[PDB]
Design a protein around this motif. Structure first.
Motif, PDB file in Angstrom:
ATOM      1  N   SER A 129     146.367  37.473  34.458  1.00 28.09           N
ATOM      2  CA  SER A 129     145.878  36.112  34.601  1.00 28.09           C
ATOM      3  C   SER A 129     146.347  35.553  35.938  1.00 28.09           C
ATOM      4  CB  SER A 129     146.362  35.216  33.456  1.00 28.09           C
ATOM      5  OG  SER A 129     146.039  33.855  33.732  1.00 28.09           O
ATOM      6  N   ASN A 150     142.105  34.779  28.919  1.00 25.65           N
ATOM      7  CA  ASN A 150     141.950  33.335  28.696  1.00 25.65           C
ATOM      8  C   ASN A 150     143.234  32.601  28.298  1.00 25.65           C
ATOM      9  OD1 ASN A 150     139.140  33.421  29.189  1.00 25.65           O
ATOM     10  ND2 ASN A 150     138.652  33.816  27.025  1.00 25.65           N
ATOM     11  N   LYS A 185     140.286  29.608  31.257  1.00 29.08           N
ATOM     12  CA  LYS A 185     138.934  30.099  30.951  1.00 29.08           C
ATOM     13  C   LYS A 185     137.994  29.991  32.152  1.00 29.08           C
ATOM     14  CE  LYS A 185     136.234  31.010  27.672  1.00 29.08           C
ATOM     15  NZ  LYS A 185     135.466  31.148  26.394  1.00 29.08           N
ATOM     16  N   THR A 229     138.739  33.051  34.123  1.00 27.17           N
ATOM     17  CA  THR A 229     138.103  34.246  33.557  1.00 27.17           C
ATOM     18  C   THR A 229     136.610  34.292  33.922  1.00 27.17           C
ATOM     19  OG1 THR A 229     139.655  34.287  31.687  1.00 27.17           O
ATOM     20  CG2 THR A 229     137.614  35.581  31.469  1.00 27.17           C
ATOM     21  N   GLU A 243     136.989  39.568  27.009  1.00 28.37           N
ATOM     22  CA  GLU A 243     137.544  39.108  25.741  1.00 28.37           C
ATOM     23  C   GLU A 243     137.579  40.236  24.687  1.00 28.37           C
ATOM     24  OE1 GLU A 243     134.745  35.811  25.084  1.00 28.37           O
ATOM     25  OE2 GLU A 243     135.918  34.464  26.339  1.00 28.37           O
TER      26      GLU A 243
END
Length: 188
Positions: A27, A62, A70, A73, A139
């Protein structure tokens, strides 16, 4: 032996069918991910050792940073669809964690604009179904490996890198071991 289950890597009890050969999760909100990418250069050292016929895949997650998480992402999906990962990874990391000037989806877009991606081009990708499935893929992959944290790396959908079972002082011994372990798993 030199490479051992439970030491440098672990084995997924439920191997993932059709997974990317080398799959990294990260991330842009993740402080350890900044270290991995921007200071340790783990991805880059891994690819420098990969066998011929093996590609590295990198997915965003996420669960850090809420709504912006999000957004990131979805922007990573845009980068993959546009094929500009190598132009946005550094300013996205620095915008989120160093300057902290990325606070909204618009700030993310600015990074792409500044990197030479046309606005029209970015916006069309952003709102596309191609990008929506790319988000869903990322995801799904996280679900498939039952992801618990980032950064993480999985090889042939069966083995998980275990950096805590590696050596920590020399960043460089640590990095070389990480990269060597990925190569070992790739041929396993």
């Amino acid at each position: 032996a030199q490479y051992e289950d439970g030491k440098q890597y672990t084995t997924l009890e439920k191997p993932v069918a059709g997974a990317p050969q080398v799959l990294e999760f990260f991330s842009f909100f993740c402080p350890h991910c900044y270290q991995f990418e921007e200071v340790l250069h783990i991805s880059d050292n891994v690819k420098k050792k990969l066998p011929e016929g093996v590609k590295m895949t990198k997915y965003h997650v996420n669960f850090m940073g809420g709504d912006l998480g999000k957004d990131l992402t979805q922007a990573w999906a845009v980068a993959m669809a546009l094929g500009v990962e190598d132009k946005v990874t550094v300013p996205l990391f620095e915008g989120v964690q160093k300057t902290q000037t990325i606070r909204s989806a618009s700030d993310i877009r600015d990074v792409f604009i500044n990197a030479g991606i046309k606005g029209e081009e970015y916006d069309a990708a952003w709102n596309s179904f191609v990008v929506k499935s790319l988000v869903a893929q990322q995801e799904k992959a996280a679900a498939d490996v039952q992801l618990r944290g980032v950064p993480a790396m999985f090889v042939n959908g069966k083995y998980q890198l275990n950096p805590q079972g590696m050596d920590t002082s020399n960043m460089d011994v640590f990095v070389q071991q990480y990269a060597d372990t990925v190569k070992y798993l790739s041929e396993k």
